[PDB]
Amino acid sequence: CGGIRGERG
């Protein structure tokens, strides 16, 4: 789980 936001979402 990441993409353009690698932490939680």
- C-alpha–C-alpha distance, residues 4 and 8, integer Å: 11
* C-beta separation of 2 from 9 below 8 A: no
Please name the method used to determine this structure: NMR
* C-beta separation of 1 from 9 below 8 A: yes
Task: Determine the 3-state secondary structure of 7 from DSSP.
Answer: coil
- C-alpha–C-alpha distance, residues 8 and 1, integer Å: 7
